[PDB]
Amino acid sequence: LSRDECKRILRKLELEAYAGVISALRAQGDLTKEKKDLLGELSKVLSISTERHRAEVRRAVNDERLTTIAHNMSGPNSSSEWSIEGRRLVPLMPRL
Amino acid sequence: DLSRDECKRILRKLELEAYAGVISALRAQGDLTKEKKDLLGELSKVLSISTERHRAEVRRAVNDERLTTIAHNMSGPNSSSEWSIEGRRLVPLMP
């Protein structure tokens, strides 16, 4: 494998790893402090930006299947903290 | 609609895939660091991952040609020492 290929596969692996964790935790129930701390450590090690983190959170909370799963595993309202956690950032202006 | 039982199984599957995906990613980065080991212990608590599961994933990863090639490119030829010991773990990783 070439240098760029190794970097590409590794980066994809990292992004996929973070998304898989978000999915799992989201399906278990709402975000707890324990989980948020774990996520903070995980995003650090995998080089996941806060913006990317928020995107995975919203995607996950919008996932109707993950929601159905949470719904059954821990209740109807078990997406409260996740929904806030994922809120987009104030919109700047094109370019900066 | 999906039944509560199916949800439980999907959830289990997500937990297992999530831990595997992290093991894979970390392995491609290089050898397991102390920081990385602690992260995996916390992960395995939250995702309810048995010591046997942990070993299988590590053994798979450390013996995966692709992942290993990435690790050498990323950090040098001795990127398996710690992963090898982890593959032989019998006591709980902890957190």
Side-chain angles (χ1 to χ4, degrees), chain A residues 1-95, chain B residues 2-95:
Chain A
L1 294 174
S2 74
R3 158 61 67 165
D4 288 322
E5 183 65 12
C6 291
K7 283 157 60 69
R8 288 159 125 54
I9 297 167
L10 168 67
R11 187 51 184 162
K12 181 162 179 60
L13 282 170
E14 302 186 322
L15 307 180
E16 283 166 25
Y18 196 72
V21 172
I22 297 297
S23 289
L25 307 185
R26 191 275 170 286
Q28 301 179 5
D30 210 358
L31 184 61
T32 57
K33 175 197 171 185
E34 310 316 312
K35 286 166 183 168
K36 191 209 165 42
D37 287 330
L38 166 59
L39 287 177
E41 268 305 282
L42 185 57
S43 62
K44 183 179 68 175
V45 166
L46 300 185
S47 301
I48 302 305
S49 66
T50 58
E51 190 173 316
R52 187 175 183 86
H53 158 69
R54 270 184 277 265
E56 297 294 349
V57 168
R58 291 190 311 282
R59 183 273 307 163
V61 298
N62 286 350
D63 184 318
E64 77 170 61
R65 296 234 270 267
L66 284 179
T67 294
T68 298
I69 299 308
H71 179 62
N72 281 284
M73 298 304 101
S74 64
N77 307 304
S78 57
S79 186
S80 161
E81 300 267 15
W82 283 119
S83 70
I84 298 160
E85 175 74 20
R87 275 198 174 79
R88 283 172 182 266
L89 298 180
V90 298
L92 287 174
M93 229 190 327
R95 183 176 300 90
Chain B
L2 284 175
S3 174
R4 185 167 40 166
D5 307 309
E6 182 167 15
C7 287
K8 183 178 179 45
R9 288 188 291 108
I10 295 169
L11 169 63
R12 189 49 184 157
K13 178 188 171 170
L14 293 170
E15 300 181 317
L16 299 175
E17 306 199 333
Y19 193 72
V22 175
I23 288 297
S24 299
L26 298 181
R27 200 274 167 280
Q29 297 179 330
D31 204 3
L32 178 72
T33 62
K34 172 55 162 67
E35 187 184 19
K36 281 167 180 171
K37 189 178 83 67
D38 294 328
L39 166 54
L40 292 172
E42 178 57 38
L43 239 349
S44 47
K45 174 182 311 164
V46 183
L47 298 177
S48 299
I49 298 302
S50 76
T51 55
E52 287 90 327
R53 183 77 266 162
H54 176 67
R55 292 175 71 192
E57 294 303 337
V58 174
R59 300 232 267 297
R60 160 183 69 71
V62 84
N63 291 297
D64 181 298
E65 285 179 63
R66 276 68 164 60
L67 302 183
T68 302
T69 299
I70 305 305
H72 291 342
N73 176 283
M74 288 302 134
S75 65
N78 314 107
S79 316
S80 327
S81 289
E82 300 303 304
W83 285 116
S84 287
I85 307 180
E86 272 307 301
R88 288 146 58 206
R89 170 183 285 287
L90 296 178
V91 295
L93 213 187
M94 268 188 281

